[PDB]
Amino acid sequence: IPNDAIRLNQLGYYPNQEKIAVVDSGKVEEFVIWDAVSGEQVFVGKSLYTAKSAWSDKTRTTLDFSAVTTPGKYILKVNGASVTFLIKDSVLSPLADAALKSFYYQRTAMPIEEQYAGQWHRMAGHPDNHVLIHPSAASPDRPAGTIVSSSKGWYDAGDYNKYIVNSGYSIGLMQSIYQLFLDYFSRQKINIPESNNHTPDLLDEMQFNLDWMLTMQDPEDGGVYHKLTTPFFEGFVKPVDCKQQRYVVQKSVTAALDFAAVMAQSSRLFASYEEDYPGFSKRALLAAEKAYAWAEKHPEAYYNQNLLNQKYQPAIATGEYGDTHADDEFFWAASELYFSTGKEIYREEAIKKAPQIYTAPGWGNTFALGIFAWLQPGRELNEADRRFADSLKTELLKYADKVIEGAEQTPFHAPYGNDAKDFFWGCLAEKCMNQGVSLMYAYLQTGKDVYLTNAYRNMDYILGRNATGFCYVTGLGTKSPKHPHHRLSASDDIEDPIPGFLVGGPNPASPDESYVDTEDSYASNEVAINWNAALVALASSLDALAV
Ligand SMILES: [Ca+2]
Ligand SMILES: [Ca+2]
Ligand SMILES: [Cl-]
Ligand SMILES: [Cl-]
Ligand SMILES: [Mg+2]
């Protein structure tokens, strides 16, 4: 049995955490934990549980040393093999910080200076000060070819385009967790240019993209362009070598609504930070109400790229972020606008569009973001509003109970990873992390430790306790992706990838092993702001809750 076969959280364990490793295959009967320094025997485990998934004949053996609670460095010996690990406070803090700092590396329109960036420094790229109104985006005062400035914001992912749906959703998710852990985020410092101001660094980072988002709203009708893009994806070149023309394209109802929701949300969160962000809270709220108004007038204005390409030139072939179901965006936006303005007219829209069931958050399914807003503590809800919130809590708990059913008997001892349908493009964020986030919220709503225990299990999975043995976050753990599908990492002249990115993961042989660490793997090794938003959400909340 190779050392390789011992699958565990490669960052380590909190002192009071469940502590489980899984041997991926082979006959095992016993394991031992040793103090790495003193050489003292600390724990011996026997009578070990084993299990198999439906699709793999490998015998997975569970090693449970949860009773070891003293901080320190330890050695796990199983048969021939061994691995060292740490038990320590704040074990996920470097992960939470790196996940947030990834957004800094994605920033456009500014130099990425070594002081903050380390070896992954670069010159400014994509100023986006000379951007064309695409014919699909034309308005009376802005005919096709009009030049606008639409600067700042993040690169979306492995490509260099900027998308309102995905970035609005991403901020919406991170700012949901922010609101639960104000002290945590106030104290967090991640060495970005804004680390010495008076504003929590998470909010500084969000604002870098929020400021860009404001420029994507037509100052007349209030509508919001779906994305800022080149016509084609660029090759794997540095930002300074990119030469395609940049366009803003067709206004969409989902762009308008995700803009409205996140701007209404942001209005509240930045109210205290007029010093560093003067006027933003007020501007965001005004902008939000205008965007929501536009969406009301154009409720079925979906972004269909194929149809756009039949009517307009140049053809656009970058990320679609298409959706013909806007009820959830209406729900999230109306909910945020209700909480920011108090107006009953927005409440009624939220109630009309309420979800019947809880589903985890995703870029095109924003029901959960609305639900999180309704479930927020400290907000003094009236009888009807409390009754509504209570009904949403019930649905969250129904979802959570179903997710955790049988989790302790799974091969990898987590709710995520024992169903073939768990594996697909971006699954580690979309399902594993966001299932974790959902479980963390269920803990917050009930105080039932079992939900939180299961959230940590899903985190252990992405950090190495899985079928491949990868810690699926660049720059962290023992065996992590060195070749992400990421134009920034691939085109710099630095061997190690930019750190802190969650790769998409296995995406179909065994479905949970359908992963390749190569730069051409869009299918399994892509990185993205919405995937990192999930990682920031789960890692930050699990670290904050550990104390
Ligand atoms: Ca700051
Ligand atoms: Ca939707
Ligand atoms: Cl691109
Ligand atoms: Cl779901
Ligand atoms: Mg590189």
Side-chain angles (χ1 to χ4, degrees):
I1 155 179
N3 296 343
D4 230 323
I6 307 168
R7 305 292 161 86
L8 79 177
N9 181 322
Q10 294 172 18
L11 303 198
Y13 305 96
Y14 293 90
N16 291 324
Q17 198 186 332
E18 182 179 88
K19 308 182 188 66
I20 289 181
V22 173
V23 184
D24 186 53
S25 63
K27 193 165 174 43
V28 170
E29 295 179 1
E30 179 178 310
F31 75 96
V32 182
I33 307 299
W34 301 95
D35 182 313
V37 188
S38 74
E40 277 201 58
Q41 194 192 86
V42 162
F43 186 90
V44 178
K46 306 180 165 176
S47 299
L48 309 171
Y49 176 80
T50 64
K52 301 197 183 185
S53 63
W55 58 82
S56 172
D57 200 48
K58 288 166 170 181
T59 294
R60 274 64 179 255
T61 307
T62 294
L63 316 181
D64 188 342
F65 45 100
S66 299
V68 181
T69 60
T70 300
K73 181 182 176 176
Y74 295 91
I75 307 165
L76 190 167
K77 283 206 189 314
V78 194
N79 292 20
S82 72
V83 297
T84 65
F85 66 90
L86 298 178
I87 296 176
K88 64 192 285 177
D89 291 334
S90 296
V91 70
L92 304 179
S93 178
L95 174 68
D97 290 2
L100 182 56
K101 185 58 172 291
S102 74
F103 289 85
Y104 164 81
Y105 289 108
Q106 296 290 101
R107 286 189 191 178
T108 70
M110 79 178 266
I112 302 297
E113 295 171 348
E114 179 159 16
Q115 191 192 328
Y116 312 108
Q119 65 179 325
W120 306 274
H121 54 87
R122 67 185 197 267
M123 305 290 275
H126 295 92
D128 287 345
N129 47 12
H130 191 279
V131 178
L132 263 42
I133 299 293
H134 193 258
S136 61
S139 67
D141 299 347
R142 289 179 169 187
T146 299
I147 297 162
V148 298
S149 179
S150 195
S151 71
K152 301 173 71 173
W154 308 302
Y155 298 129
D156 197 53
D159 67 301
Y160 292 135
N161 305 293
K162 307 187 303 194
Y163 307 78
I164 287 293
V165 164
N166 201 44
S167 68
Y169 162 79
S170 293
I171 296 164
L173 178 58
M174 292 182 283
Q175 288 189 162
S176 298
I177 277 62
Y178 173 83
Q179 285 171 93
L180 299 167
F181 301 106
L182 294 178
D183 285 348
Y184 183 86
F185 290 111
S186 180
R187 297 184 181 271
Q188 182 189 42
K189 295 295 178 312
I190 58 168
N191 187 31
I192 52 171
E194 306 78 9
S195 288
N196 293 132
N197 70 12
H198 288 67
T199 303
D201 283 3
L202 181 148
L203 292 185
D204 294 309
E205 192 61 53
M206 306 301 99
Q207 224 286 315
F208 195 84
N209 196 80
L210 291 162
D211 199 27
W212 165 65
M213 292 183 81
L214 291 173
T215 75
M216 292 284 285
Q217 185 169 48
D218 181 336
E220 297 305 308
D221 69 354
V224 180
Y225 307 116
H226 193 71
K227 58 177 171 176
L228 188 163
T229 186
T230 49
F232 292 102
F233 290 126
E234 302 281 22
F236 279 56
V237 302
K238 298 167 193 275
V240 293
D241 300 326
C242 289
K243 293 173 193 320
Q244 283 189 73
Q245 174 64 242
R246 300 279 266 193
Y247 296 86
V248 298
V249 302
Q250 186 211 297
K251 294 166 178 155
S252 68
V253 63
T254 47
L257 291 168
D258 289 336
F259 176 103
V262 81
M263 288 294 171
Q265 189 192 49
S266 301
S267 185
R268 303 191 306 272
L269 304 184
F270 283 83
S272 296
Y273 305 107
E274 287 290 331
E275 176 177 14
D276 289 331
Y277 298 95
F280 174 60
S281 174
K282 185 189 184 71
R283 180 175 182 198
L285 186 61
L286 284 168
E289 295 199 84
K290 285 199 71 182
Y292 187 91
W294 186 99
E296 281 182 298
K297 296 194 214 84
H298 306 89
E300 301 203 348
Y302 312 132
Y303 185 80
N304 191 308
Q305 196 150 263
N306 276 4
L307 297 185
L308 183 153
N309 288 338
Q310 291 181 346
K311 293 184 58 170
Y312 303 105
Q313 289 171 335
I316 306 296
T318 58
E320 187 176 37
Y321 291 105
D323 193 5
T324 57
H325 296 90
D327 282 353
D328 50 290
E329 289 81 4
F330 271 112
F331 175 72
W332 177 35
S335 294
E336 296 288 2
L337 279 160
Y338 179 49
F339 292 122
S340 299
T341 72
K343 298 184 169 176
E344 300 174 356
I345 193 163
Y346 291 125
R347 178 196 195 279
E348 170 64 17
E349 301 304 297
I351 299 299
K352 283 193 180 192
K353 299 284 166 52
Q356 296 306 315
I357 193 176
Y358 180 89
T359 54
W363 65 259
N365 179 10
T366 60
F367 274 137
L369 298 186
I371 290 172
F372 299 155
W374 281 96
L375 295 177
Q376 221 168 286
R379 216 188 250 123
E380 299 188 359
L381 297 176
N382 69 18
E383 184 182 354
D385 285 354
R386 193 95 262 158
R387 184 206 319 146
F388 184 60
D390 282 355
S391 70
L392 298 174
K393 172 174 166 184
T394 296
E395 289 311 312
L396 169 65
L397 295 183
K398 279 188 191 167
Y399 162 93
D401 292 343
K402 201 176 299 304
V403 160
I404 65 168
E405 200 162 50
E408 290 186 352
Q409 283 72 65
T410 60
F412 286 108
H413 210 77
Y416 175 84
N418 206 38
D419 189 307
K421 292 181 166 184
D422 291 346
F423 309 102
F424 59 91
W425 193 59
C427 59
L428 296 181
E430 194 182 307
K431 192 161 191 188
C432 188
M433 286 296 93
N434 286 345
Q435 185 178 90
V437 172
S438 304
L439 289 166
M440 182 282 296
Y441 271 93
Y443 169 73
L444 291 184
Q445 291 296 304
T446 62
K448 294 174 53 161
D449 286 333
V450 66
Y451 294 131
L452 184 61
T453 292
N454 279 279
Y456 286 105
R457 292 173 180 162
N458 274 13
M459 182 60 80
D460 280 12
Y461 187 98
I462 70 156
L463 299 175
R465 192 171 74 208
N466 63 52
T468 65
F470 278 84
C471 168
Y472 290 109
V473 182
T474 61
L476 292 170
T478 295
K479 177 182 166 194
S480 55
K482 295 292 171 71
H483 300 287
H485 177 274
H486 187 207
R487 284 171 177 75
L488 286 177
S489 294
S491 65
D492 63 20
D493 300 304
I494 300 157
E495 176 176 344
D496 286 340
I498 299 175
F501 291 85
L502 179 56
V503 301
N507 176 196
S510 290
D512 56 350
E513 297 181 9
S514 298
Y515 167 76
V516 288
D517 183 25
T518 61
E519 293 83 349
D520 59 342
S521 187
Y522 194 43
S524 80
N525 216 30
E526 165 72 333
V527 300
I529 59 172
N530 53 311
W531 296 351
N532 258 60
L535 180 61
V536 165
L538 192 56
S540 302
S541 64
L542 291 181
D543 192 49
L545 288 168
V547 199

